[PDB]
């Protein structure tokens, strides 16, 4: 110069939609795309998920009992203060992260309480989630398979956006590349299905495979493309979606099963006194829990970045105006 | 493992090297023949033609391609090491630039060697305003010299001190980095390099009469603070404590010139040792060192012919 | 469940290698490429997305072993 | 206690190895890269997150080992 | 797969080796070539393609394991 | 039991390896990194907090050994 | 079947190792040359036709195992 | 306890693996950091509190073995 | 061959180590010498003969197992 | 002890691995530090008492195995 | 064909170990020197006598196994 | 031993590993440290002694075992 | 060859390891030392016989295995 | 021979282990130190006498097994 939760950071992304570069669509999507799963890796219990509110309550209330904190709104610090004021947009999303995250923990405790559903107590004299059973292979299998689905969404979302890339940036080269890989897909679905149903395809839609494989290479060939080989590598990626989600579940699940050896047992067998001889360890487990969960979230975004920076909707990518995604999405 | 790739190539580069008799021949040649003789040998293939400057410039440019682009080409320990050599050329460049900047003597007035850090970096560096800024330009490539300047800056931000304390500080920095770099020959060489630098430093600054403490460079092992102190008092008997050392011809020496002569050769004999270095860089270093000693000589002998100087005038100085 | 017929032990034992070998191979694979990136990031911020993806690449190799571990149980 | 035949021991055995090999792999991956990681912090307290960001990726393997172990479990 | 019987277990054994070893072999191959690669992005910006193209050749190894393991399968 | 099933011995052999393999992976992770710091830490006393915080993530492996070990314990 | 011979197991076992071990040898062979390659094209645009033929060779090690695979287990 | 079963003999066997393997993990960890160590008398006398905690760290691995052993003879 | 005579599998197995171990050796061997070779080529068009003439030597290692296999096979 | 007991032979194996595995880890550990060592001594005999406290660490790993060998035995 | 015994089976293993371990060993022996030679060739026929004679030496290790294999086999 | 009871042969077997593994560890330990040695004579003629006595240290693991092998020697 | 032997299987096992382990060890021993031997062409004309002697040394180890094999052999 | 000769075999197995394990260790010991060895000739021709001191050392480890076989001896 001379609903509301869903609107709030997104509202700020509406402006960032509007910055142009090309007729293909611009950065913005990430924040509304993440949220259910982001929160939804967190599938804990009384001692895992359900106490993280206190921390959020130490970002809106504070602490006294060790050294120092006074107001997170006034973000005073050991390493940049400033940032803390700015990242109130994040403070909302975090307060929400825990709240919903606690909640899929409580979804989890529907199925780790109630005596008809499992052998688990409805609400016992110890604590909920008591002799744990979602671990059990068949129960577990379902939670694993739950993870798989979100990965499928992502396969579509990225390549569709490529076809839009060439569509609206006008490149036939991009168009065909993004579209062309989907020519393959029916056959891919065949091959999985013959094991997934143990049957369905792959010998049913495996005759269809014989025609599915050619359709792929038609418009890859229209660009000419000596740049054929790559298509193998694309095959690694699908599986990756599954695996990343799978861990987000499994490491999650493992975490909840660790509260058995945290709070139902960990020396002797933990009743209501040796239980609280585990509480010698119990306080500790909270802080250990804190450490790991920082680790957890980053897989999602990595996952997301696989898709984003294959230029599926994003014009920061290896530089290029707009700036590191790390910095980008937060408002 | 893997120096294999480096090693094969360098051996091919070692093929372009000259007969000893060149240097001998040169002793008696005319300038026209000087031109012919250099032009028939490897620096000569970019010889800028007739004239003494053409020779100097050719030597530089020839090293620019043969050495100057080497470090990049993967980034193992060795690659760092090559980087250090070329970085010394940078260090000078930086000093010069600093002085130019400092002395109110504009951009134009500086010209620089090949190195890891090259023209544009420099151009920016000059064009950075503040001493803080200069150090931050150095942070652009990130080097122990980078680090050295930022560290140097904390107390002071003006040329002469910055340089003095920097040089000392820098050599200390190199030493640590070098402890992390793990060619034993280079480890020994660093201590000796330290020592050599002390002997000459002590020598030039002797008759300051001062404490060893102001500029005793460190990592000495034919040297220590006391010897340094002593020499600084005028005392050549320090050189006479040399006895079974690598530096053994420096005993009986009284003058800096002769001192330097002896040193350059001592370091050269050692430098030549690394040949068929497993990790290549004994050999590459040696190839470099030899190229220097050769290079120096091309220039010497060039002057000798060019100005029609006596034989006896170079005869001393072409021998190791 | 519990005790099994002749079959179960052979597949179950043998299962561990499929997963173990690829996973181990990826970690070493990651150790050189992963190591390589860091100097590059510092210096060249622009190249960073590539580096980040480099770390990803071996990890597909693992996925197949676990997949083989699943199929063995599936008609069992 | 609960027991079976020769067969349960076999499943149990091969399960551990899956788990062991990946952990081993995790350590190696992290060690070279981790070593690589450090400089950005050393220089820069502001940059500090990147070094942290580096460490995570191999650790996913340990969890894959759990995944295969779990299916072997629950049928044990 | 399936329940009791030595044979499914015999075929299962060699299936695992095929996948684990090969998956691992591809990763190591990627690891040096990938490591060189971080420079490539610089070396030319053009050379980013070259590095990408390089990676493909080792990657065949994994696929081989899968084919032979398949050959053991399909035997019911 | 105290001279229980055939199983207990078979599994008991493999039990040590869980503790060991994880231990080995953690140790290697620790070795490179522990070395890596050393001038920077020396220099930054404040960083007595930073180092103290930095190391942790591979260490999680040891804890995993206890998780498999307890589940084993109760069937012994 | 419902039992597979000790004879069947023997032909089945070694085959995977043959392909896998050799595969590691190909991967490492490719890895050094490929890495070396990354400088080599970049400067030597001239080398590129030669290079395009030059690299190819190592994969043959796996193939030997595979021919040995062709005989071994069609009789299983 | 007593001169006891093969099964019991197997739990006695496995007592050793726990201890040997973790100990190896401790040694490798100590080795890299130890190598760095030699400098220290030169580096920083100040580090004597740092040196005192750093060398300490890998050692956790061994303790895990003694507990699992401690329970085993109590469950011989 | 199939579920039949005890010997033929038994003779067949021990044969493999010769071929596999040596094959691995060929790859590593090629990888260092090969690594040296390319730079000589890279510079020198003339070295395309030198380099070719050098490169060959390791491949014999593989062969020893295969000859031992040629006479052995068909007892099967 | 003539034909010594069934317990005695089994324990005799599993103790040995405890010492041996730990020993291999010790050796690798000692190699790195020893290589490192040589300059410091050259500089000071005087530091040697401190040095005597520094050097020590790897040797413990074997001892743990011997302890295992003693407790099992005493049974002949 | 044949229908022999155990004696043949054990000897086939050690027949493989002797050749394979040596074959690998020769290859490694060859790898460091073989890489080393190459510049000398470019320059020198005068070193051609060295190259030709020098590379040869490790290779004896393979021969011991093969002579024992010729006398053994035919009824192995 | 005799040609008699198996057990004495077993107790001797697990003894042999004690010496052999400790020896394996000694050899690696000696290789780096020994190499360091050629310089030492240079470093001081007096230091030739330091180097030699230093070189000794890993080697201890075996020696306590011969004393122990003797206290054993008779109880079989 | 000829008739089997359960006894023979026991003798055979320790025979192979001597020959094999040493063979591998000799090859590695030769590669590094061998690398010193090429270096000799640089160091001295005087040294050339030495360059050979240096290359010569390790190979004796395999042979030690072969004499122990000579007593074990004759069991064909 | 025949069964009830398995003990003569059991002592035969354990003879080998001592010899093999050490042999591998000797080769590694030799590899670094032999590589080092060339520097001594340069340093002094008298230090060739030192070079003579360098070469021997690891091989004693193998000698320990033969003496041990001897103190027992011939009960085989």
Swiss-Prot record, chain B:
Q: Does the keyword Phosphoprotein apply?
A: no
A GO cellular component annotation here is:
proton-transporting V-type ATPase, V0 domain
* Superkingdom classification of source: Bacteria
S-S bonds: none
Q: Which Gene3D superfamilies match?
A: ATP synthase (C/AC39) subunit, domain 3, V-type ATP synthase subunit C domain
Q: What is an annotated GO biological process for this record, any one?
A: proton motive force-driven plasma membrane ATP synthesis
Q: Name one Pfam family in it.
A: vATP-synt_AC39
Protein's name according to its UniProt entry: V-type ATP synthase subunit C
Give the species. Thermus thermophilus (strain ATCC 27634 / DSM 579 / HB8)
């Amino acid at each position: 110069v001379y609903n509301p939760p869903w609107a709030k950071p997104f509202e700020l992304l509406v402006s960032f939609l509007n910055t142009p570069k090309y007729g293909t669509f611009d950065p913005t999507p990430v924040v509304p795309v993440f949220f259910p799963f982001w929160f939804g890796m967190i599938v804990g219990d009384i001692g895992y998920a359900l106490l993280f509110y206190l921390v959020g309550r130490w970002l809106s209330g504070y602490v006294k009992r060790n050294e120092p904190l006074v107001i997170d709104l006034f973000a005073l610090k050991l390493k940049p203060q400033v940032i803390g004021k700015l990242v109130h947009i994040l403070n909302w999303m975090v307060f929400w992260t825990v709240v919903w995250g606690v909640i899929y923990g409580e979804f989890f405790g529907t199925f780790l309480e109630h005596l008809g559903v499992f052998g688990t107590p409805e609400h016992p004299g110890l604590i909920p989630i008591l002799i744990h059973r979602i671990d059990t292979a068949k129960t577990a299998n379902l939670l694993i398979l739950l993870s798989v689905a979100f990965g499928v969404v992502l396969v579509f979302f990225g390549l569709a956006l490529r076809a839009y890339l060439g569509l609206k940036h006008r490149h036939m080269a991009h168009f065909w590349e993004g579209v062309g890989y989907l020519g393959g897909l029916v056959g891919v679905l065949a091959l999985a299905a013959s094991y997934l149903g143990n049957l369905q395809a792959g010998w049913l839609q495996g005759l269809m495979y014989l025609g599915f494989g050619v359709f792929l290479l038609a418009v890859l060939m229209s660009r000419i493309w000596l740049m054929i080989p790559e298509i193998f590598t694309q095959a690694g990626h699908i599986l990756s979606h599954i695996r990343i989600y799978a861990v987000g579940a499994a490491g999650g699940i493992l975490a909840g099963l660790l509260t058995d050896v945290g709070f139902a047992l960990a020396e002797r067998l933990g009743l209501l006194g040796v239980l609280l001889g585990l509480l010698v360890a119990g306080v500790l487990h909270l802080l250990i829990l804190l450490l790991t969960t920082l680790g957890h979230m980053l897989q999602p975004i990595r996952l997301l970045w696989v898709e984003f920076f294959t230029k599926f909707g994003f014009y920061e990518e290896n530089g290029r105006p707009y700036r590191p995604f790390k910095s980008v999405r937060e408002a | 493992d893997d120096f294999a790739y480096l090693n094969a190539r360098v051996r091919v580069r070692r093929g372009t090297l000259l007969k000893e008799s060149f240097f001998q021949e040169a002793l008696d040649l005319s300038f026209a023949d000087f031109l012919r003789l250099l032009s028939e040998t490897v620096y000569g293939g970019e010889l800028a033609g007739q004239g003494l400057p053409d020779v100097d410039r050719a030597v530089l440019r020839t090293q620019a391609k043969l050495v100057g682009d080497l470090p990049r080409l993967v980034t193992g320990e060795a690659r760092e090491a090559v980087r250090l050599l070329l970085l010394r050329n940078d260090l000078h460049n930086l000093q010069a630039l600093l002085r130019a900047k400092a002395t109110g003597r504009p951009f134009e007035e500086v010209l620089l060697l090949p190195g890891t850090l090259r023209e544009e970096v420099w151009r920016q560096a000059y064009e950075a305003q503040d001493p803080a800024g200069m150090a931050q330009v150095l942070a652009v490539p990130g080097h122990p010299l980078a680090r050295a300047l930022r560290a140097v800056l904390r107390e002071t931000q003006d040329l002469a001190r910055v340089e003095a304390l920097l040089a000392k500080r820098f050599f200390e920095d190199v030493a640590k980095a070098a402890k992390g770099l793990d060619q034993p020959a280079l480890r020994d060489y660093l201590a000796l390099e330290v020592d050599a630098e002390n002997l000459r430093t002590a020598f030039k600054l002797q008759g300051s009469g001062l404490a060893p403490d102001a500029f005793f460079l460190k990592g000495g092992r034919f040297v220590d603070r006391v010897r340094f102190a002593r020499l600084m008092e005028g005392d050549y008997a320090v050189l006479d404590e040399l006895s079974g050392t690598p530096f053994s011809g420096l005993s009986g020496v009284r003058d800096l010139k002769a001192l330097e002569r002896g040193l350059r050769c001592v370091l050269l004999k050692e430098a030549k040792k690394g040949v068929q270095d497993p990790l290549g860089v004994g050999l590459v270093l040696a190839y470099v060192k030899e190229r220097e000693w050769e290079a120096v000589r091309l220039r010497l002998l060039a002057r000798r012919a060019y100005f029609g100087l006596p034989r006896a005038q170079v005869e001393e100085e072409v021998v190791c | 469940a519990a005790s099994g017929g002749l079959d179960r032990g052979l597949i179950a034992v043998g299962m561990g290698l499929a997963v173990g070998l690829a996973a181990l191979g990826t970690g070493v694979a990651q150790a050189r490429i992963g190591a390589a990136g860091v100097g590059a990031i510092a210096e060249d911020r622009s190249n960073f997305g590539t580096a980040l993806i480099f770390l990803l690449l071996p990890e597909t190799l693992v996925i197949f072993g676990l997949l083989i571990a699943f199929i063995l149980n599936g008609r069992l």
